[PDB]
Every structure is written in structure tokens, then in C-alpha cells.
Design a protein around this ligand. Structure first.
Ligand code: A3P
Ligand code: OAQ
Length: 246
């Protein structure tokens, strides 16, 4: 059991739905940020060490490959931040794995990103996210790892993450680059809304009979989850309000 599909799509492009879709297709687990937050928060420091390794004048690529392989043990696929930023290293490690690029309108993406993953530093919603994350046992190291992995995906050392215009152009550049460096036969570009057909064709499987394509992880749902975590101060107490999400 090793990686068959590498999800290179950025966060907030339908990765949790793609995660669920792949788990339906393969009946084996797919990695996602939800795996880290809700199941394995100890992975945060490991991802941080790997991203830190990339910032060295001479990076130890074998250390990174071995670290990626350990993180992804028991998974059939990976999606989302932070793994998407390592899609090149994953491609090298798993030469037979196919690559998915989940994609969507860039303006909707940015809006989604600011609501969940990367608020502007002066946005009051950032404090509500933090307070909510406190309930989940998430600390400040989490934000450093996600920030560093976005910067790593965009291949930038210095960047003003509060500038929407920069993030929009980074998004387009990122998706262009994936399309440039992944051979066409090894890549499926999956637009938000595309559903089973193109995906199943690509992965050489039939469309799941009587099972609809997943639709999960809206910023509306994430805003409500943040609100409810703050109100009740317990995930277990509110999880029934979020069926089928985690
Ligand atoms: N089947 C589907 N059709 C349309 N949008 C979908 C979808 N599945 C997920 N999404 C959207 O993809 C985004 C989440 O992606 P990710 O899981 O990578 O964080 C959300 O966007 P919004 O925040 O605009 O609602 C979510 O609503
Ligand atoms: C709602 C509040 C309690 N925070 C929890 C949410 C869960 C989904 C999520 C997903 C990503 C990337 O998919 C990131 N990210 O990269 O920062 C952060 C979060 N945070």
C-alpha cells in the first residue's frame, strides 16, 4: 500500500471532497489537512522540519523523501496543504502515481482562502480562528507550518501574504507550473463541479454506482464550526452539527 494519486491542488480548491472521492474509489485512506488537525497533530512538527530542510543551501533530498514516505505510510493518496507543495518530490518518489490538479475560479479561491486558511494579519476574524483552534488543541506552530508550506508552494522566501493581488498571481502561476511540468498523460485537471466522470476515466475505474460526488468543507461550514467551537468549547459536544465532515 503506497501512493497512487498525488493531489497537487492548492487548499480551498475542493481537496477535502477529492480526499473523500479517492477514499470511495480505493477504500483506503487519503491524506489531507484534516488528517493532521483532527487525527495526527504530531505531524505538524515533521512537516515543519521538511519545509525547513528545503530552505538550506544544500537540502538533503533523501531526508525529505524518507520523511514524506513515513508521513504517508498507509495512505493511497494525498491532497491539500502541506503535501501539495511537495508534489514534485512525490512524483519523483512514486513514478507511477498519477497527479491531480484541483482548480477553481481564482477570485472564489482567494475569498475562501482568506476565510479559513490565511486571513490578512489585521483581519479580526484571525482571532476567532485562533480561539476556535485553541479548542482543538492547535497552537501557533500550526500557522507557521501552513504559512511556510504556502510560501514553499509559491517558491517565495519573502512575500506579503496580506496582498490579494500577489496571492492571485501566485495562484495562477502555481497552477500554470503544475501543468507545465507534469506530463499531460499523467495529469488530470479537475474543475470544481466536474464530478466522477473525468476522474474515474483517469484512474481507470467505473463511476461509483448510486454514490454522488462529495461536496464538503465550505467556508460557511468552517465559519459555523469556528463559532460553535468558541461557544461550546468542545469538538465532541458539537461534532453532531457537522455530519460526514471530519
Ligand atoms: N462538489 C463540489 N462542488 C462545488 N464546490 C465544492 C465541491 N466540493 C468542495 N467544494 C468547495 O471547495 C472548497 C473547499 O476546498 P478544500 O477542501 O480544498 O478546502 C469550498 O469552497 P468555498 O469555501 O468557496 O465554499 C467548497 O465549498
Ligand atoms: C475552523 C477552525 C477551527 N480551523 C479549522 C480549519 C480546518 C480546515 C483547515 C484546512 C486548511 C487547509 O486545508 C487549513 N490551513 O492550511 O490553515 C486550516 C484549516 N483550519
Amino acid at each position: 500500500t503506497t501512493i497512487q494519486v498525488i493531489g497537487a491542488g492548492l487548499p480551498r480548491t475542493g481537496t477535502n471532497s477529492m480526499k473523500k472521492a479517492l477514499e470511495i474509489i480505493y477504500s483506503k485512506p487519503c491524506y489531507h489537512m484534516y488528517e493532521i488537525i483532527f487525527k495526527k497533530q504530531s505531524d505538524i512538527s515533521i512537516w515543519q522540519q521538511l519545509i525547513d530542510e528545503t530552505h538550506k543551501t544544500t537540502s538533503d533530498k533523501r531526508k525529505i523523501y524518507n520523511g514524506l514516505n513515513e508521513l504517508l505510510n498507509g495512505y493511497i493518496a494525498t491532497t491539500d496543504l502541506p503535501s501539495c507543495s511537495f508534489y514534485k518530490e512525490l512524483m519523483t518518489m512514486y513514478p507511477n502515481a498519477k497527479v491531480l490538479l484541483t482548480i477553481r475560479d481564482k477570485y472564489d479561491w482567494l475569498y475562501s482562502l482568506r476565510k479559513v486558511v490565511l486571513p490578512k494579519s489585521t483581519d479580526p476574524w484571525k482571532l476567532k480562528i485562533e480561539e476556535g483552534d485553541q479548542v482543538l488543541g492547535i497552537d501557533s506552530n500550526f500557522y507557521k507550518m501552513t504559512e511556510d508550506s504556502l510560501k514553499f508552494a509559491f517558491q517565495k522566501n519573502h512575500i506579503n501574504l496580506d496582498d490579494d493581488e500577489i496571492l492571485l498571481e501566485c495562484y495562477d502561476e502555481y497552477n500554470r507550473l503544475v501543468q507545465e511540468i507534469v506530463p499531460p498523460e499523467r495529469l488530470l485537471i479537475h474543475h470544481l463541479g466536474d464530478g466522477w466522470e473525468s476522474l474515474c476515466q483517469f484512474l481507470n475505474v467505473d463511476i461509483p454506482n448510486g454514490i454522488s460526488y462529495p461536496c464538503a468543507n465550505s467556508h460557511h461550514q468552517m465559519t459555523q464550526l469556528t463559532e460553535q467551537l468558541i461557544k461550546h468549547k468542545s469538538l465532541d459536544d458539537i461534532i453532531h452539527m457537522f455530519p460526514g465532515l471530519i
